[PDB]
Amino acid sequence: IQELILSEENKTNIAVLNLGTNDRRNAVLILETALHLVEKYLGKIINTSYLYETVPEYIVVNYINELMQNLEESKYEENKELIDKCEEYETFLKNGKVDNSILKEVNVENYLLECNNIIVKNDEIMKNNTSYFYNLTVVVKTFVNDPLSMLVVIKYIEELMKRIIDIDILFFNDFTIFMKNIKLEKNMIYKILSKYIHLEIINNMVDNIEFLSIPHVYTTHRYSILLCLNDMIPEYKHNVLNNTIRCLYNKYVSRMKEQYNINIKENNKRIYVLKDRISYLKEKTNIVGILNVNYVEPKRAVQRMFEMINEGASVIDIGGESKISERDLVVPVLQLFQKEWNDIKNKIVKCDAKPIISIDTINYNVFKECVDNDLVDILNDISACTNNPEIIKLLKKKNKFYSVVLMHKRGNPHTMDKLTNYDNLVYDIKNYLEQRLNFLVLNGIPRYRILFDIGLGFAKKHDQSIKLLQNIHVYDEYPLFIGYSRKRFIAHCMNDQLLYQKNICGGLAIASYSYYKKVDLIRVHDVLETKSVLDVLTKIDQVK
Amino acid sequence: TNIAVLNLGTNDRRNAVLILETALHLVEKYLGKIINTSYLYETVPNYINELMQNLEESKYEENKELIDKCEEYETFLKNGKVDNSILKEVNVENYLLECNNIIVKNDEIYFYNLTVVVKTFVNDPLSMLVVIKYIEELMKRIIDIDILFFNDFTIFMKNIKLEKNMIYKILSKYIHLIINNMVDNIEFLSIPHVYTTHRYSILLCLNDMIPEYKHNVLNNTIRCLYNKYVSRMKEQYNINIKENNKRIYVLKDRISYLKEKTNIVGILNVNEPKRAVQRMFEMINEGASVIDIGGEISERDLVVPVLQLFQKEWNDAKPIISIDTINYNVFKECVDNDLVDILNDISACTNNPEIIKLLKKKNKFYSVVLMHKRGNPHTMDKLTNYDNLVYDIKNYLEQRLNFLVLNGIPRYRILFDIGLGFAKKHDQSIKLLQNIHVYDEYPLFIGYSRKRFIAHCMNDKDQLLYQKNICGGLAIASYSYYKKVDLIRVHDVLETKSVLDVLTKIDQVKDPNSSSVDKLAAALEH
Numbered sequence A: 001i002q003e004l005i006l007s008e009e010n011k012t013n014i015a016v017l018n019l020g021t022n023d024r025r026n027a028v029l030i031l032e033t034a035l036h037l038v039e040k041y042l043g044k045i046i047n048t049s050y051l052y053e054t055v056p057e058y059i060v061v062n063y064i065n066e067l068m069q070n071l072e073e074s075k076y077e078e079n080k081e082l083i084d085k086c087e088e089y090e091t092f093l094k095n096g097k098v099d100n101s102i103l104k105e106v107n108v109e110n111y112l113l114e115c116n117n118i119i120v121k122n123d124e125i126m127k128n129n130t131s132y133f134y135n136l137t138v139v140v141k142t143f144v145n146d147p148l149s150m151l152v153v154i155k156y157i158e159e160l161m162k163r164i165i166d167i168d169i170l171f172f173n174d175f176t177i178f179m180k181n182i183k184l185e186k187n188m189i190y191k192i193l194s195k196y197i198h199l200e201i202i203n204n205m206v207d208n209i210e211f212l213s214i215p216h217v218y219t220t221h222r223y224s225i226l227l228c229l230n231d232m233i234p235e236y237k238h239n240v241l242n243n244t245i246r247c248l249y250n251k252y253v254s255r256m257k258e259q260y261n262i263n264i265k266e267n268n269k270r271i272y273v274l275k276d277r278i279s280y281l282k283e284k285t286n287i288v289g290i291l292n293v294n295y296v297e298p299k300r301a302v303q304r305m306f307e308m309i310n311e312g313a314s315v316i317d318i319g320g321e322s323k324i325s326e327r328d329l330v331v332p333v334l335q336l337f338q339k340e341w342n343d344i345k346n347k348i349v350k351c352d353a354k355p356i357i358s359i360d361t362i363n364y365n366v367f368k369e370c371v372d373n374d375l376v377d378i379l380n381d382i383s384a385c386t387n388n389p390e391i392i393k394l395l396k397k398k399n400k401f402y403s404v405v406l407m408h409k410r411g412n413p414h415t416m417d418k419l420t421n422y423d424n425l426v427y428d429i430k431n432y433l434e435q436r437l438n439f440l441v442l443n444g445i446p447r448y449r450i451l452f453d454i455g456l457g458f459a460k461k462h463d464q465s466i467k468l469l470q471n472i473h474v475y476d477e478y479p480l481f482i483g484y485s486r487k488r489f490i491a492h493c494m495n496d497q498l499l500y501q502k503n504i505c506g507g508l509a510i511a512s513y514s515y516y517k518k519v520d521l522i523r524v525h526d527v528l529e530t531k532s533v534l535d536v537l538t539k540i541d542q543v544k
Numbered sequence B: 001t002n003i004a005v006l007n008l009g010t011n012d013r014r015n016a017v018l019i020l021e022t023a024l025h026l027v028e029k030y031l032g033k034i035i036n037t038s039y040l041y042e043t044v045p046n047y048i049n050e051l052m053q054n055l056e057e058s059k060y061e062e063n064k065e066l067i068d069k070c071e072e073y074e075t076f077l078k079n080g081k082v083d084n085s086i087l088k089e090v091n092v093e094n095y096l097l098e099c100n101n102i103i104v105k106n107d108e109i110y111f112y113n114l115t116v117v118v119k120t121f122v123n124d125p126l127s128m129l130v131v132i133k134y135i136e137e138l139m140k141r142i143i144d145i146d147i148l149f150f151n152d153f154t155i156f157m158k159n160i161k162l163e164k165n166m167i168y169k170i171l172s173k174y175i176h177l178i179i180n181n182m183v184d185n186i187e188f189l190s191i192p193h194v195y196t197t198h199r200y201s202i203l204l205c206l207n208d209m210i211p212e213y214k215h216n217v218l219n220n221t222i223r224c225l226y227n228k229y230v231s232r233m234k235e236q237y238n239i240n241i242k243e244n245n246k247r248i249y250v251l252k253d254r255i256s257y258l259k260e261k262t263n264i265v266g267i268l269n270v271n272e273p274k275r276a277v278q279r280m281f282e283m284i285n286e287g288a289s290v291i292d293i294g295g296e297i298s299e300r301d302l303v304v305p306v307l308q309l310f311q312k313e314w315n316d317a318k319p320i321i322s323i324d325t326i327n328y329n330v331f332k333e334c335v336d337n338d339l340v341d342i343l344n345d346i347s348a349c350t351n352n353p354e355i356i357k358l359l360k361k362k363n364k365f366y367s368v369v370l371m372h373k374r375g376n377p378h379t380m381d382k383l384t385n386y387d388n389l390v391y392d393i394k395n396y397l398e399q400r401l402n403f404l405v406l407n408g409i410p411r412y413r414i415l416f417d418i419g420l421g422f423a424k425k426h427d428q429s430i431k432l433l434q435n436i437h438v439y440d441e442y443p444l445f446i447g448y449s450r451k452r453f454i455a456h457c458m459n460d461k462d463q464l465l466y467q468k469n470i471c472g473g474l475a476i477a478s479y480s481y482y483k484k485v486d487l488i489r490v491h492d493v494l495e496t497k498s499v500l501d502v503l504t505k506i507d508q509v510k511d512p513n514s515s516s517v518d519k520l521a522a523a524l525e526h
């Protein structure tokens, strides 16, 4: 019992996990706490799905903050170093030569029978007599020897966090396992946990581990699982599966339309996260108000910030970059705002009226200072983290994750207008942003915290800027952020302060278009004007 | 007194209006009364001034008297007991064989169509064809006028030869008075016309006027025959037939394709004539296609000088001029002095139905905006109970169009306005916009600009509300653009033009399938 499980030969495995909660209000917090415990106790997070609000598929407070300060250390070291490839993961996808399973495997026929046996039994049990699920999948490059050991460590995580959180193993390497009548005595659980954790309870866990199925029994039966896997590993084909995850996903979607007339997408919603709350993808065009700092007037800038809030902005994007350092332009403004917002002698109940703060910077030192001082929520990196990818390390704090805008450009402001050739503009830009996302996600950044920005006017001719807008549908599956405001291409569409006026007016046309295209965020100079447009369009859509 | 259905055709694109409207007058002058018209259609298979002055007078009197019913026309539609045919009438199968015989013989090798209904004093379709061919000759493919129906008669006359003596005495019966080309042209006579059920353009026009008509020859109602052709062109040939067979409305004298452009109508609201003519020029330069002038010291004194000064300064890309009046005498003056092109009647011509008489001259037709409202400015906020808001207003406006059409105002010159903010609560104005698609078949003109409902949608204080209200209007401009509203009446022209331009640009796709092509190319690349 103690020989191959606690074997000193350290290996690198690939595991796929499903994370789920029922707590709508705290979903982000619950799930992201689990994500941290996974980085800490299991290995490295190298892929995530989007977050989903999910229809239940049963049939065929702040102690979390205090837990985070009392965690036992892992026996395995964290490494935040950027990686550009992962060999084990490539092997896992292909899906070939890894180490032999230390747990006994079953063949396909045995797996299928045992799996169906569990499901029929479960459908029957459950036919007895509510709330949405919040789901996420993750890929972990794990130092844990085997899936039973991993299940033990996962149950500990579940215990530490305690329906609040459900963590399941969907895949572990290419293994096919069905062990039926597991009992591990308490000392064996202790021994497993001690291999991985500097232990400082177990009583619960003995009861809880009844059997082990790899793949998870419900992998092919739950839409919510297939929905999450489709984001991460669509080309993947496990031995016990009739097809790739993408094919299984697509067939499920059509099976609901043809056999049931249900569009299964309608009540299973994709979620992105700007700060700490759920946003439904494509459900709201958010206004991002632009705050340019270039003079020094930190008091005037903070007044403008407050003006913008009242004018209707959900997000404030501050930037010094377009003598005195960038840091000295932005940090004092953010420090003043932070003070002035805290010294609100108004309703302390009115504290969920705070705008999300975004910083338009490519510079590590500036972002590092803002983050340490709790001055910002989002990184707006116009180089899509290519100028200094080390910034990606600052998006992960132990309990906390930050969101990030990835924008496309070529060159710098003086070389930009030259670098205009594209073989296939729309798709070049899209694939570029997709590749940039794969890199952050490979490096442990939650997929649902990443925003795509085509970068209008950045190494684009005016016709190319227009064409990217005509073809904006290309981002229908993704969180989309655009900045068209006061850019020169608008003017090029119209048939000196009159020219500045027509430009602002022309932007509001793009605000309308964005609204109808369900653009998630628009970065604008003119907040009041934009808010007024969106309000009217919203009201015309509201059927009473 | 007979009921005659005519088709009128031309192929000159530039002068289609002037060609077909002149033909309309000559029909009015020489044949009876126009009591129905269709829309103008573009379908796919000039000293008229000198002619208008030296025109021969009819043997019948022209009365512009309004009517609200026409019993003969109602009997035509039924189709009940009418006067017996004074000509050789064939039966069902005999007509069908003879019909097929002209079709197969002709099957051996842009079009602008308009149908009309005429209450005619002319005794028979053959006599009418004589007057019709004479009408065609006075105007000389330039204009072709056919007889689609004459009462309920099933007629075929196999070979016709008539002399200068016979033709002169038919043409004398109806006119006080060359016959050279006329003798050679009249070969035969078919009632109904041979191509009635065959050409799409004909069925398209007839569906405007007489959808429930069922001639003894034809196997279904004009609508059911129309609807079959539409569904068969899609199912059989995978072609949307409405793509190349476009509906036309006319604002002045030029063709406008229904639902193809959102025109800006600039508001000139008087109370100083010099300042107001400056604003008109400004508005043209900001991108207004139409100017809407309204004073409503007298209404006439506020507006007629401004229009007269404008007309002059222009003589020292012309905007279409619209007058916002319900006053008969004010419109009459403007129209006699060629100062306006359009009547904007906010009472939908119910304040004074006589105003409709002024939308016609010998050579002129003016267009009109019909707006829905209840009451006056002081009472309207109270008059907000509707059985079915959306449908009561549409039917209301449809009844009004029918009335103007019964009286010979061309169908294609009448514009619909829902009257936002007139006897509508804020939610009802919104509901009306939400349901604007109910006007997909019609020329639609709306005015939201600066009205109170815009403000109600929003979540230095009075100046802020003013600014928000102009900006909120731009959202409605955008909506109007996507919904394909034909005209929008606005205060802020530059702003609205800026918005419409950007939206037009976004919509101009150089290659209509480059979207899927580029997608495939990306999918085929490593």
Ligand SMILES: COc1ncnc(NS(=O)(=O)c2ccc(NCC3=Nc4c(nc(N)[nH]c4=O)NC3)cc2)c1OC
Pocket: A322, A360, A380, A381, A382, A405, A407, A413, A417, A453, A455, A456, A457, A458, A481, A482, A483, A484, A486, A487, A488, A489, A523
């Ligand atoms: C030399 O003068 C010029 N000549 C021709 N075209 C020009 N381009 S432009 O006027 O259209 C223009 C204007 C402003 C910008 N940058 C503003 C930003 N735009 C964004 C941001 N962040 C995010 N995420 N997305 C953004 O779109 N941060 C700042 C870029 C292009 C131009 O200006 C540099």
Ligand SMILES: COc1ncnc(NS(=O)(=O)c2ccc(NCC3=Nc4c(nc(N)[nH]c4=O)NC3)cc2)c1OC
Pocket: B324, B344, B346, B369, B371, B377, B378, B417, B419, B420, B421, B422, B445, B446, B447, B448, B450, B451, B452, B453, B489
């Ligand atoms: C004295 O009465 C009033 N009292 C309080 N608030 C009022 N404000 S309101 O915003 O609801 C509003 C504003 C303007 C109007 N009418 C302007 C016009 N509107 C049109 C037109 N012609 C056409 N064809 N279509 C038009 O919509 N001519 C003039 C109607 C309602 C108000 O109305 C004048």
Ligand SMILES: Nc1ncnc2c1ncn2[C@@H]1O[C@H](COP(=O)(O)O)[C@@H](O)[C@H]1O
Pocket: A151, A166, A167, A168, A169, A170, A208, A209, A210, A211, A212, A213, A214, A215, A216, A217
């Ligand atoms: N791949 C798996 N991941 C998680 N739990 C599993 C798996 N295979 C079997 N189980 C068992 O399923 C039960 C967990 O159910 P739940 O409490 O709903 O997560 C426990 O008895 C586990 O031992």
Ligand SMILES: Nc1ncnc2c1ncn2[C@@H]1O[C@H](COP(=O)(O)O)[C@@H](O)[C@H]1O
Pocket: B129, B144, B145, B146, B147, B148, B185, B186, B187, B188, B189, B190, B191, B192, B193, B194
């Ligand atoms: N119902 C009808 N209306 C008009 N013309 C007709 C009719 N029946 C036969 N025709 C003949 O068709 C000729 C005109 O043909 P077209 O102008 O080429 O369509 C006339 O001169 C008539 O002789």
Ligand SMILES: Nc1nc2c(c(=O)[nH]1)N=C(CO)CN2
Pocket: A020, A021, A054, A055, A056, A057, A058, A133, A135, A166, A222, A224
């Ligand atoms: N949609 C959905 N349904 C479920 C889920 C879940 O995560 N999502 N988890 C279950 C057992 O924990 C039971 N049912």
Ligand SMILES: [Ca+2]
Pocket: A038, A039, A040, A043, A044, A045, A077, A078, A079
């Ligand atoms: Ca780790």
Ligand SMILES: [Ca+2]
Pocket: B028, B029, B032, B033, B034, B061, B062, B063
């Ligand atoms: Ca007459």
Ligand SMILES: [Mg+2]
Pocket: A166, A167, A168
């Ligand atoms: Mg579970």
Ligand SMILES: [Mg+2]
Pocket: B144, B145, B146
């Ligand atoms: Mg003909």
